[PDB]
Amino acid sequence: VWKDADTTLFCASDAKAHETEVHNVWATHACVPTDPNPQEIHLENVTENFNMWKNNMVEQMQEDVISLWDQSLQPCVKLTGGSVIKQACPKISFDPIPIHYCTPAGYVILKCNDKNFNGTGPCKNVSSVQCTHGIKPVVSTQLLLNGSLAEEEIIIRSENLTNNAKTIIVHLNKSVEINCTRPSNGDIRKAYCEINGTKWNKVLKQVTEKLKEHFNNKTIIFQPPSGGDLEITMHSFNCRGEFFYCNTTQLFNNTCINGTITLPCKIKQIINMWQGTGQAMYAPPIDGKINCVSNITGILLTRDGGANNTSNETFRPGGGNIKDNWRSELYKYKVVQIE
Ligand SMILES: O=C(NC[C@H]1NCCc2ccccc21)C(=O)Nc1ccc(Cl)c(F)c1
Ligand SMILES: *[C@@H]1O[C@H](CO)[C@@H](O)[C@H](O)[C@H]1NC(C)=O
Ligand SMILES: *[C@@H]1O[C@H](CO)[C@@H](O)[C@H](O)[C@H]1NC(C)=O
Ligand SMILES: *[C@@H]1O[C@H](CO)[C@@H](O)[C@H](O)[C@H]1NC(C)=O
Ligand SMILES: *[C@@H]1O[C@H](CO)[C@@H](O)[C@H](O)[C@H]1NC(C)=O
Ligand SMILES: *[C@@H]1O[C@H](CO)[C@@H](O)[C@H](O)[C@H]1NC(C)=O
Ligand SMILES: *[C@@H]1O[C@H](CO)[C@@H](O)[C@H](O)[C@H]1NC(C)=O
Ligand SMILES: *[C@@H]1O[C@H](CO)[C@@H](O)[C@H](O)[C@H]1NC(C)=O
Ligand SMILES: *[C@@H]1O[C@H](CO)[C@@H](O)[C@H](O)[C@H]1NC(C)=O
Ligand SMILES: *[C@@H]1O[C@H](CO)[C@@H](O)[C@H](O)[C@H]1NC(C)=O
Ligand SMILES: *[C@@H]1O[C@H](CO)[C@@H](O)[C@H](O)[C@H]1NC(C)=O
Ligand SMILES: *[C@@H]1O[C@H](CO)[C@@H](O)[C@H](O)[C@H]1NC(C)=O
Secondary structure (H helix, E strand, C coil), X not given: CXXXXXXXXXXXXXXXXXXXXXXXXXXXXXXXXXXXXCCEEEECCCCEEEEHHHCHHHHHHHHHHHHHHHHHCCCCXXXXXXXXXXXXXXXXXXXXXXXXXXXXXXXXEEEECCCCCCCEEEECCEEEECECCCECCCCECCEEECCCCCCCCCEEECCCCCCCCCCEEEEEEEEEEEEEEECCCCCCCEEEEEEEHHHHHHHHHHHHHHHHHHCCCCEEEECCCCCCCHHHHCEEEEXXXXXXXXXXXXXXXXXXXXXXXXXXXXXXXXXXXXXXXXEXXXXXXXXXXXXXXXXXXXXXXXXXXXXXCCCEEEEEECCCCHHHHHHHHHCCEEEEEEC
16 A cells, blocks of 8 residues: 655766766766666556656756756856846766665655556556666756657647647657757857758658647647847757757748758857756867757646637747656655555
8 A cells, every 4th residue: 555745856867977077977966876676566457646847856956957956057147136146157078867866764655657658647557666767867858868758659748738838749759850059160159050841841740640639629820039148048958068049940940830940049158047046157068070869758838828719829949947847757756654
């Protein structure tokens, strides 16, 4: 017997104790070795209710990631509660590694194995495990990168689709590589991302179709963000310690629904910290080719309001709350207390 409960989880990884990479260094001092031959008990005739949108596991991982950044990612100047904090801002080795989240004694992690589980409600196929799968603390907006792919069909996730204020998480079932590089040799901040239009449009089309299922076959329209912080209006992400801001206008136009889509990007030193604690300035980009090939595994969308009296539903690429990023990977997990 067991009950839904919250407890201080611990982490496990395969970090190398000799790596200068921030993630490795952190996990080396904050995590333990992974279990080479882990156990998993499949519960037959068991029905458990999940709720990705209200899961303490998310908050905890958020706290870890924040800690990892507070230790190995301090900017030159930090702007917070009216205070100005200045400190060294040396270049570092940056490349996220898988992080497993585990439960201590007396607790276990229930895992939903339903093919098309949307993150909320009852789960038919439930199993018990000590740790989750390896999850990369990849911070980004608009597009989810290097995540996990859905098993069968594309999955739409939301605490409440009827509410436009609630973020939407599109879980892709097929990856779409995005090639981002900052050429060695002008403007040391000019960058770009290449994407196979054929693949992207094919996926985006499938996304629209699935969205129709949840919106009564209403016409699905994509549009670029109305306004706000650059981190939201643009696909922001971190590549090798450098912050990339990419214009995804070409990615979200309802025309191609063929060639290589080239997105205009720029490395920003001044940024609005995702921790939501003001602004911060980092050092200039390093020299040489700055390349990062990532898998687009999910999309963060925001639905426009005031469309109830129209046959259209407008979706725009959003983001900001990194917690949603962790949800897109922890949706199938929940902690329970064993008697
Ligand atoms: O300032 C941010 N959100 C603040 C705020 N924005 C509006 C929406 C929102 C929602 C919840 C919490 C904060 C916010 C932010 O997300 N920054 C950021 C920086 C670097 C990368 Cl790589 C990145 F992906 C994001
Ligand atoms: C997820 O499944 C539950 C249970 O069937 C359902 O109530 C809810 O509407 C679904 N959520 C989405 C986003 O479709
Ligand atoms: C999930 O359960 C259904 C029956 O409810 C079963 O048909 C299906 O094979 C299961 N999915 C998995 C884990 O393969
Ligand atoms: C990139 O996508 C491919 C194809 O799905 C996958 O095999 C590979 O593991 C992905 N790389 C990641 C997630 O880092
Ligand atoms: C992805 O999911 C969609 C349904 O959302 C499905 O039609 C399609 O066959 C899936 N693609 C793959 C590669 O399985
Ligand atoms: C979902 O959101 C809609 C729109 O705000 C709201 O009317 C409704 O009460 C919400 N449903 C739930 C389950 O809270
Ligand atoms: C990524 O794009 C760059 C620039 O076009 C190219 O040189 C490189 O070969 C690409 N990488 C992959 C994995 O295709
Ligand atoms: C683009 O994607 C298609 C499949 O959608 C593939 O057949 C083709 O080889 C890709 N083009 C390039 C430039 O790799
Ligand atoms: C969308 O249209 C199809 C084909 O007519 C129909 O089978 C399905 O019920 C509709 N889906 C809705 C209205 O959610
Ligand atoms: C984003 O970039 C596109 C071109 O890729 C441009 O047309 C558009 O004006 C830009 N949006 C803004 C206002 O940043
Ligand atoms: C839509 O995206 C395609 C990608 O090839 C681009 O060529 C086209 O200019 C875009 N249309 C717009 C921005 O209206
Ligand atoms: C995505 O994964 C690839 C392969 O490990 C890595 O090279 C790249 O840096 C990752 N992208 C991001 C933004 O973390």
